[PDB]
Every structure is written in C-alpha cells, then in structure tokens.
Write a protein that binds this DNA or RNA. Structure first.
Ligand SMILES: [K+]
Ligand SMILES: [K+]
Ligand SMILES: [K+]
Ligand SMILES: [Mg+2]
Ligand SMILES: [Mg+2]
Ligand SMILES: [Mg+2]
Ligand SMILES: [Mg+2]
Ligand SMILES: [Mg+2]
Ligand SMILES: [Mg+2]
Ligand SMILES: [Mg+2]
Ligand SMILES: [Mg+2]
Ligand SMILES: [Zn+2]
Lengths: 36, 103, 343, 16, 132, 77, 225
RNA sequence: AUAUACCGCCAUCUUCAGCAAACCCUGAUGAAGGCUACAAAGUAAGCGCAAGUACCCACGUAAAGACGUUAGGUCAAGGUGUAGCCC
C-alpha cells in the first residue's frame, strides 16, 4: 500500500537568526506559517 | 456413508463449536407458551420451510444409530431421558428418527 | 440562476427537517423519512459527462515517460463508465442493505432479554470483557414540566453478570434510550452481588421471600432440570450462572421489585459450610440415585458437637399450600408442566 | 436495532 | 432570538472554527473581514461589482476544490491583482492541487480580465476553535 | 565503521533506529523485505555500542528469518 | 526470584505476630480512665448498638466499659500500625471544630492526612472526577468523631464502606458503630480523651513507619553480603 | 397547495437568569430528590448572564441576550421536502 504523503518540516526550522529576511519576503505575500 | 466424520471435521467445529446443534435454534410462534407439538416436518416434497429445525437445516447431520455423538446431544446426560421435541425444536418427523436411532 | 444555488449542507438541513416544531416534541412521526445521502461520496474530481481525460487530475500525468495530452473518451467508452458508476451505486446501496440482524428478546418488539455487550472499560485501564449485560425493562416515563409540558424520558433496568456468581443490576435514566443503556450497564458493574451456588449449578436451599408486594418462591433442583422460572429470572440466572432452578412469582409482577427481590434472596442463602460451622455438625447429603450412601457435603472447621440435634417429633414449619396441593395430586392446571424450549 | 446498525498509518516524503 | 450567522449551542460535540464561532456583532471586534478591497470606502466606486465577483469566487472555489477547503476564503485585491488565499486539507495528491491551481488561476484571469493568484495553505485537519 | 565517544555513539544509534524503520516500512513491503547483510550487522552493532542491548538481542532473530550471515565483529561484541 | 523473598520477609513476617509493634505498651485501663474515656452521654442519647460496650449508667450518665475499650483499642491500634507499616494512606476525619487544629497537626506530624472541614459530596465515591482518574484513595480512614455537627453519622462512614475502605472510629454512646470496621468505644468530647487518642495513633503510626525502614535497611545490607 | 415538512431571517417572554452533557449520592435502586458556611451530598465541561468591545468615561445608551414557550410570522426574499399543473 502506498504511504500517505508526509508534510515536510517548516523551513523556518532551517532559517538562521542572522539571515537576510528581505529575501524571504521580497514582495507583498499572504502570511505563511511555514515561512514566518 | 460415514456420518460420524462430519462431527469430527473442521466445518462442524466452525459452525457449532462445542455446543449442541440445536443450541441456537428458536421456534417462531405467537404467545409466550409455544404449541405443545413441533411442526410435523420441515421438508415437504423436497422443499424446506423458512425456519428448518436443527436437523433439517443442516443436510450433513445424519440421524443414524452409529453417529452416537449426534444422538447424545438429544439425550439428557444427567437423567438419560430423550428430550421431547419442543425442547430442541426438532420436527416430529426428525424426533421419531432420533428416538428410533437412539434406541 | 447560479447565484440562487446553495451548498449540500444547507439543502439537506432543509430537506430533512430535523429541527422544527415537528422534531421538537416529536409532533411529526416518520414511517417515511427522508434519509441524508452523501452525493460527493463516489464522485471523482475531473470526471464529467463529456468524458474528457484531464492529465494530472483524473488520468495519470505522464504515460510512457511523456506528458499526456487532453483526450476525450469515445461515446461507447463513456457509456460503460456511466453504466459502471450506476452499478457501483446499487452495489453501495446493496452493501448498506446487507446489515446483520440481531436476535430478538422475550418478544419481537420487546427490549427485555436483549444483550448490550460487556460494560465499557473504566478510565484506569479497567475492563469487563467477562461480564454480559441483559436488558430487563425499558420504560418511557413522561414528566410534566412547568414550561415545556409533557416531556419524554427513558428509564432502563439492566442486569450484568459474569456467569460465575458475580452479578448486579442498575437503573438508567436519560432522554435518549442509548444513554440510559450506558448509564445502567456501567453503574451495575459497580454494584455487583456475589451469589453462592450449590455445585455451581443451583441454589443451596429453597428460598421463599416477599419484597414489597412481589413474592418469589425458589426451589433447589437437580442437574438437568433447567431454568423453569419467570423469563426475567431466567435472564438473570444465566448471568449469575444458575443452571437448574424452579421459581414462582406471585402478587405484583413488578420487574424492579422482582429484580431486586431476587438478588436480595439469592444473597441471603445459607451455604452448607455456614450451616455446618453454625451448628458444629456434619451436613450429610442423601441422594436417591446413590441409595443409602451418606455423602458428607460440609464438616465444621471448629470442634464437632457430641450431642445429637434434637429430633422434634413434628416440626413447626410453615408450609405452602401450593407445594402440598401438588404433592397430593390435587393441583390441576393446564399450564403447569408444559413442554417448552430449552432454557 | 434488531434490523442492524451498519453506519460503516505510515507516512513518507515523496511517496509512490 | 437572533439567528444570523450563529452556530447554536449543542451537546458539546460540534467542532466550530474561529470564524464560525463568532456571531456578526463580533465583526471588526474579534474577527476581521474575509474580503478586503476599496469599494466600500467613502467616495469609492464599483462596490456592486466587487460584491458579485466575490460571491462567485467563493462558489467557484468550493466546487473546484470539493471537500478540500478547510475554512472560508480570504480575498485580497491590490491594484488590479486578485489574490485568493485558501486553507485546504492534505487529502488530495499534490499533483491535483497543482493542476487545480494552474487551471483555476488561468480560468479566473481570463474571466475577470485581471492577474489572479491562488495561495494554498494546507492543514492536516480542520482547525477547531471550540466544541459547541 | 569504528567506535566513537559515547555522545556520538548515542546519536548514531538514534539514526540507525530511524533507518531500521525505513527498512521495515518500505513501499516494496508487498515484496519480501530485502535486508542486506551489511545493514543488519551495522544496525545491531550500533545498538550494542550505544547500550541499547535489548534492541540488539531482539534483532538477532532477523538473521535467521532472512538467513543472513552474522558478522564476526557483531558476535564478539 | 527476589520478589517472593522480599514480600515474605517484609510484608508477611509482621502478620505472623500477635503484637508486632508492641502497641499494648502505649496505653492502660488506668491511662484511659485518667483521660476520662469512660465518660459517655446521658442515657436519653444512648444508641442501641452501643449497649454492648457500655458498663452502666451512673445517675443517668452512661459509663463506657474500659475493659472492652482496651481490647478494641488494641485491635484498632494494631490495625493502624500494620497499615502504616505497609505504607498505606491513613486519613483522619472529624467534624468537631474544637479539635480541628489539633487533628490537622497530628496528621502532618505523623506524615498522614487530615480532613476536618466540610466534607463535600462525592469526595470518596466520585474521587476520580474531583481529583483525577489516577488519584489514589485512602487505604485507612480513622474517625476521631463519627458524628457530624447535626448529630448524624458522618457521611464518610457510609462512603468509606461503599469504597471498601476500612475505618477506625472512636464511638461514643450516641454513635452508630455498625459500619465502622474497628470501633473503639470511648469518650470523643473531653479534650483529655481526644488528645490521648491523637497521641496513640500518632505514636502507633510513627513507630510502624520507623519499623518499616529498619527492616528494609537490614534486608538490603544482608542482601549485598 | 402545505410555515402543521423545512432551511434562511425573526417576533415573544427577555424591562429574564437560567439551560445542561458527563458523573456521584438519597428514596429498600418507586414516580422522584439532591440546600443549610459555627454548612447536613453534591461536583460539573459547555452555553447565557457577567466580563470585554462600540459610542463621549469606569456612567449611560447601544450591542448582546442561552435553553425553552406560542406547531408564533414568513413556501410571495431566496432556496427547498412532499403533493399538484405541463396547449
Ligand atoms: K420557523
Ligand atoms: K419560501
Ligand atoms: K414548497
Ligand atoms: Mg414480530
Ligand atoms: Mg430583537
Ligand atoms: Mg460524644
Ligand atoms: Mg411556525
Ligand atoms: Mg459599561
Ligand atoms: Mg437592544
Ligand atoms: Mg453582555
Ligand atoms: Mg401556525
Ligand atoms: Zn425438521
């Protein structure tokens, strides 16, 4: 039986606390929990 | 030809287990007090009635004087008396065959 | 109009009419009832009448390592799809139609005698798989209320038992019949009596008691006698583990008085060991099938008396005219000693 | 009631 | 008794979302608006057209993503851009979600003659605010 | 391949468990599970060196079930 | 292998001795008499189930037979010590407010529990709801006063029997001892009587807990070597 | 056609404060009942009230106002079950 698809971990867990945030949200976009 | 084999098979054990073949049978009748005689026969001109008795409902049960394991189910183990037909629900036709086979 | 259409939930809530003055007081009855059906159940996203095959939605996206293109099923190929979905709809309905029937109780429309299964497992990983539950009475009680008039509640009486002497009963009350079942059967398992059985098949002695206006007279019987008792007593006896007993109920035939009266009488029966300890004498059983052989059934654990029990030439015990009238052949009843199914 | 009442795991990244 | 947009008390078994749990008097107090545009501001025009378009987009998305939407749509308009933000479930395969996004974005862009974007946020199950 | 300080060895045993789960829950599960000999020997050794002996002893059955030769190093440890 | 020896040397050994904790040295008929334990209520307040334990009436005042009290008290203290030895939860219950403070301190000092306040409905019969599904109930409830403030039986007497919890209780001449497992006929009103009871139970409980530690420690030292 | 099949939106008490799942105990395990603070069997999630928010304040006015009552009003807002019409 095919395994059900597993949602990946939010990429916020890969973000460094000294990153360039403007590159994450360069333009107006809706709030994304997995990205904020 | 060898009726005693059915009672030793796996099909019998799955359907009846260790209880008597008549354990789960219930007569359909009006009132709380049943009629004092069971139906004359469950097989009438090769056709079976809607609620056949414990013997007539299983065609592999053969009332035969050698199949003593089946006959014991219709005799009281503590008193040795043959149950009357309303006790087990066997039709009058099969009860006479059981009583003659038991004797 | 497209803008006047509603969702499936809105349409079913209206069509079913489950909320309303009809359904508030059961003012409307339902021999014919609209039944909710899920119309998105067997529907596949991408499937339409025209039979188009959309790559990535209803057919695979890639075929033979190449991306599929838009295609449409042939008129014949689409009729089969439509026919296959109609058959699948009757097969689904046929599967729902095939529902396992449950056995009836004391009568076809009666709740009494129906099994409810074992009580639910308690919070602390407690389980009662060994216990069986039987219904004894399901009543509709109607309460007049200050503002809402006549309201309908359910009172249920159930008995539980493990078939090895431990059995109890409890009343359940709720607006819904299935909540009353849960309360009664779960509460009863916390109010279990232990019932002593002679040779694990019958009572130790004849029991005659009255509870309020309900009289119950029980007789110890030998093996093979079966349960020749009021149908409710038969049900309770199977839960306790009594196989052979006669009982006669007189006076008021109140299921509750009968139930709690029966447990009161079965819990106050003196065993043979208690009699031997109380009187410091041997209890000797004489069986006619064993002739004059004396069978000691119980002996006192403490010292054994040396003085014989006084032999009163005539006992001053009160007798039941019904028992005496039968032993003298003066009891005539067309209903006594009738042939019945094994109980 | 006597007619019958029949109302009737592992996860993977990049599943197949 | 007021009925409008009020999920009524039951036996404690009915899960309601944050939006469903708040009656109309809580709008602008505890809950925001599901569509944001300039048509209802003082001195602004075309409120009637924005309203009909929003009613359609909600029906279009309900039937285009059947059983997949886990909450009401959030419709955002900036300039001529139309952004549709939807909370969806994780039952449909991702390929079908990409098909329906590509299909819906293109179809709605040609219907209303504006650049339309659809932003999907997936949840494992409907988010429950309380059990009424 | 080699033994390591206790802190690292514990980390390698938490991964070996997750890898073991991957072997156990393959999508080829419809086909008989292919447990290479090296994988079974390595997964067992990592449990021992981490102190999860209970898990290592249980795995020994899988050498007989799949008929995979045990490694000399595993037997000595 | 090692559990059977543990339970046999520690849990089963005390049960083979008639007075394993020597609680008979804690009191005497004279010590009870000086504490006024024999003083009962007036005859008009007598409970009929307390007549077996009454010596007589001195000018319409019932006198409790201290010869029986001593035997009942021996059993009550012995049971209490054995339950403390087995690490059972002992709960003291009393509604007499003259002694609420005294009883709460006696419980805290012996390492046990006290409930001297308004007993809420279902504390015992509905404990899982009130405290939680994993709440452990008392293994022994000791009543220093069996009556509530309206002169009726304390609700916990019935509720203790419902939950199959054994009860130790001081039963004066106006009390009902039927459902009290280990009743002790004695004066529950005089401060000297109540103070004596607290010393005896406190001492019995404290000795039994120290005995449990002594036995365990010896069983471990001997086990290693 | 049927508001006496309904959704939807409301009137009314309400210028109210109660409703109640799940348990527990009492009455012999009857229909029923469950409060005393120097307290005597009640514990209660939840809903409402309350709180909060709006308007010029913490005031006031709005808003809110459960369950249930009147088969209350609306099939003619729209939708819709059942029945009826289709030259
Ligand atoms: K209405
Ligand atoms: K209408
Ligand atoms: K209509
Ligand atoms: Mg019928
Ligand atoms: Mg109003
Ligand atoms: Mg007193
Ligand atoms: Mg109406
Ligand atoms: Mg104010
Ligand atoms: Mg107002
Ligand atoms: Mg308010
Ligand atoms: Mg009307
Ligand atoms: Zn037949």
């Amino acid at each position: 039986r095919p395994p059900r698809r597993k949602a990946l971990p939010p990429r916020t867990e890969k973000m460094a606390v000294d990153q360039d945030w403007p590159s994450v949200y360069p333009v107006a976009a809706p709030f994304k929990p997995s990205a904020v | 030809d060898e009726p005693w084999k059915y009672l030793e098979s796996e099909e019998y054990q799955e359907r009846y287990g260790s209880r008597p073949v008549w354990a789960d049978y219930r007569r359909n009748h009006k009132g709380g007090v049943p009629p004092q005689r069971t139906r004359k026969t469950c097989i009438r001109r090769n056709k079976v009635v809607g609620n056949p008795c414990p013997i007539c409902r299983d065609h592999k049960l053969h009332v035969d004087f050698r199949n003593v394991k089946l006959l014991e189910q219709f005799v009281c183990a503590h008193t040795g008396i043959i149950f009357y037909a309303p006790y087990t629900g066997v039709c009058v036709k099969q009860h006479k065959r059981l009583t003659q086979a038991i004797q | 109009s497209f803008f006047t259409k509603l969702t499936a939930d809105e349409l079913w809530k209206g069509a079913l009419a489950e909320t309303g003055a009809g359904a508030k007081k059961g003012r409307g009855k339902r021999t014919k009832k609209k039944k909710r059906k899920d119309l998105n159940r067997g529907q596949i996203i991408g499937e339409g009448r025209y039979g188009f095959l959309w790559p990535g939605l209803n057919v695979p996206l890639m075929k033979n390592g190449a991306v599929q293109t838009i295609a449409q099923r042939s008129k014949e190929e689409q009729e089969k799809v439509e026919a296959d979905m109609i058959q699948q709809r009757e097969e689904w309905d046929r599967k729902k139609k095939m529902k396992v029937k449950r056995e009836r109780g004391w009568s076809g429309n009666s709740w009494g005698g129906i099994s409810l299964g074992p009580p639910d497992p308690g919070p602390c990983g407690e389980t009662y798989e060994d216990f069986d539950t039987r219904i004894l009475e399901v009543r509709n009680v109607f309460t007049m209320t200050a503002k809402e008039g006549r309201k309908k509640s359910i009172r249920v009486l159930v008995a539980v038992g493990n078939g090895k002497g431990a059995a109890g009963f409890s009343i359940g009350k709720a607006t819904d019949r299935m909540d009353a079942f849960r309360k009664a059967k779960n509460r009863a398992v916390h109010h279990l009596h232990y019932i002593e059985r002679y040779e694990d098949h019958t009572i130790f002695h004849d029991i005659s008691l009255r509870f309020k206006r309900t009289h119950i007279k029980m007789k110890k019987q030998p093996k093979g006698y079966g349960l020749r008792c009021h149908r409710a007593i038969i049900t309770i006896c199977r839960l306790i583990g009594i196989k052979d007993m006669y009982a006669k109920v007189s006076g008021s035939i109140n299921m509750l008085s009968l139930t709690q009266g029966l447990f009161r009488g079965l819990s106050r029966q003196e065993t043979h060991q208690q009699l031997a300890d109380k009187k410091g004498l041997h209890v000797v059983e004489i069986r006619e099938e064993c002739g004059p052989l004396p069978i000691v059934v119980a002996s006192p654990r403490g010292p054994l008396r040396k003085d014989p029990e006084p032999e009163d030439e005539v006992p001053d015990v009160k007798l039941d005219w019904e028992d005496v009238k039968t032993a003298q052949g003066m009891k005539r009843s067309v209903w006594s000693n009738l042939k019945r199914a094994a109980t | 009631y006597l007619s019958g009442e029949e109302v009737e795991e592992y996860e993977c990244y990049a599943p197949d | 008794k007021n009925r409008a947009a009020r999920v009524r008390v039951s036996k404690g078994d009915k899960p309601v979302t944050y939006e469903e749990a708040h009656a109309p008097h809580y709008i602008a107090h505890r809950k925001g608006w599901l569509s944001l545009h300039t048509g209802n501001l003082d001195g602004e025009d075309h409120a009637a057209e924005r309203t009909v378009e929003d009613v359609f987009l909600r029906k279009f998305m309900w039937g285009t993503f059947p059983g997949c939407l886990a909450d009401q749509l959030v419709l955002k308009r900036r300039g001529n851009q139309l952004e549709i933000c939807a909370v969806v479930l994780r039952q449909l395969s991702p390929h079908k979600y990409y098909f329906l996004v590509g299909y819906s974005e293109t179809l709605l862009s040609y219907f209303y003659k504006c650049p339309v974007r659809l932003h999907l946020q997936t949840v494992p199950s409907k988010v429950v605010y309380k059990y009424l | 391949r080699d033994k390591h300080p206790p802190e690292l060895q514990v980390a390698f045993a938490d991964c070996a468990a997750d890898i073991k789960s991957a072997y156990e829950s393959q999508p080829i599960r419809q086909t008989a599970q292919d447990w290479p000999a090296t994988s079974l020997n390595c997964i067992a050794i990592l449990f021992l060196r981490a102190g999860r002996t209970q898990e290592a002893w249980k795995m020994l059955g899988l050498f007989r079930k799949h008929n995979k030769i045990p490694r000399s190093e595993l037997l000595n440890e | 292998e090692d559990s059977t020896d543990f339970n046999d040397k520690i849990l089963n050994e005390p049960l083979k001795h008639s007075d394993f904790f020597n609680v008979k040295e804690l009191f005497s008929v004279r010590s009870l008499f000086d504490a006024r334990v024999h003083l009962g209520h007036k005859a008009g307040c007598r409970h009929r189930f307390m007549e077996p334990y009454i010596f007589g009436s001195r000018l319409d005042h019932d006198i409790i037979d201290l010869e029986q009290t001593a035997t009942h008290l021996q059993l009550a203290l012995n049971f209490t010590a054995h339950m403390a030895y087995r690490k059972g939860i002992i709960l003291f219950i009393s509604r007499n407010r003259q002694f609420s403070y005294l009883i709460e301190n006696m419980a805290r000092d012996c390492g046990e529990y006290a409930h001297t306040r308004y007993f809420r409905g279902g504390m015992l019969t509905n404990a899982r709801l009130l405290f939680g599904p994993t709440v452990r109930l008392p293994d022994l409830i000791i009543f220093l006063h069996t009556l509530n403030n309206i002169f009726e039986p304390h609700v916990a007497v019935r509720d203790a029997a419902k939950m199959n919890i054994p009860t130790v209780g001081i039963v004066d001449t106006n009390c009902n001892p039927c459902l009290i497992t280990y009743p002790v006929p004695g004066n529950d009103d005089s401060p000297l009587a109540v103070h004596l009871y607290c010393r005896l139970f406190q001492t019995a409980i404290t000795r039994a807990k120290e005995k449990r530690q002594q036995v365990e420690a010896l069983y471990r030292l001997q086990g290693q070597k």
